Design a protein around this ligand. Structure first.
Ligand code: SF4
Ligand SMILES: [Cl-]
Length: 298
């Protein structure tokens, strides 16, 4: 019984389990806190636990370690990785900076810790517009997601240069205008909640544009929603609001990296104290500073 074993080991290890909204239902069901990556990392800084088991992808566990350097942070599989974050290389940032010497570098939190060390400021989907509006430059380097960059450009009026030029999340890139039309045909009383990682023409059809935390916040505004994000978010929303109706926008919006994590490797993570997440000191210090500037600018 993996659940019973996990619960006992969590107590033995003085551990907290943090799960991203895209984790499998059986993982969400054993987590202590569920949410998006930055919010989970922040909430753990106020928790008296010795060990964090991060049920999510590598950059999320890295952010938890950056903000909780004094805790052991475990990732259940090193194959839990983010294809979008991995598209942004330090080279891309430096090459972009050498080309636009006066442009600030704004890093979406969905990005490696190493990339964060070169950012002037980080952003979440929820604070990206307010942060970028406060930058003096009308030209901004933004990464790694070109679709979020386009949304920020629209809402700020600034020129936003995506780094890398084609950075994107393959899960969110799948959604199309045909998916929007089908959603309205199959669920005519639903409103559309759309992640800003979706393509701009799909963003324009949204009733609300928000990442997963904002979807949870704004779900109270209507009783039926079609959800344009990774499909496990539907499970999360149905558990939060059993009185509402939620429908996935697609049959295939599946993040392979998120689903590298299973109940069995959460058990093995606590049993064997693996896999330990470490962040080099200089990267961690610089990544912290960009995050702190984000919170001051928002
Ligand atoms: S859903 Fe997209 S952005 Fe999130 S971890 Fe998976 S690949 Fe990365
Ligand atoms: Cl994600």
């Amino acid at each position: 019984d993996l659940v019973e074993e996990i619960l006992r080991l969590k107590e033995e290890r003085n551990a907290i389990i943090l799960a991203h909204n895209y984790q499998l239902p059986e993982v969400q069901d054993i987590a202590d806190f569920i949410g998006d990556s930055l919010e989970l990392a922040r909430r753990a800084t106020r928790v008296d636990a010795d060990v964090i088991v991060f049920a999510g992808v590598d950059f999320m566990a890295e952010t938890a370690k950056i903000l909780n350097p004094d805790k052991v942070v475990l990732i259940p599989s090193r194959e839990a990785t983010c294809a979008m974050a991995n598209m942004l290389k330090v080279e891309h940032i430096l090459e972009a900076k050498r080309k636009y010497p006066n442009a600030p570098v704004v890093l979406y939190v969905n990005s490696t810790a190493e990339a964060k060390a070169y950012a002037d400021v980080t952003v979440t989907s929820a604070n990206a517009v307010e942060v970028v509006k406060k930058l003096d430059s009308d030209v901004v380097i933004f990464g790694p997601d070109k679709n979020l960059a386009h949304y920020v450009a629209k809402m700020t009026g600034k020129k936003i240069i995506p780094v890398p030029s084609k950075g994107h999340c393959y899960v969110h890139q799948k959604f199309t205008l045909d998916d929007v039309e089908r959603a309205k045909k199959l669920h005519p009383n639903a409103k559309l909640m759309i992640h800003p990682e979706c393509i701009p023409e799909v963003q324009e059809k949204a009733d609300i544009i928000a990442s997963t935390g904002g979807m949870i916040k704004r779900a109270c505004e209507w009783d039926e929603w079609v959800v344009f994000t990774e499909r496990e978010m539907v499970y999360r929303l149905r558990k939060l609001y059993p009185q509402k109706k939620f429908y996935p926008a697609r049959e295939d919006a599946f993040c392979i990296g998120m689903k590298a994590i299973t109940l069995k490797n959460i058990y093995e993570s606590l049993k064997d104290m693996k896999y330990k997440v470490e962040v080099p000191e200089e990267i961690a210090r610089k990544a912290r500073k960009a995050i702190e500037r984000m919170l001051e600018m928002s």
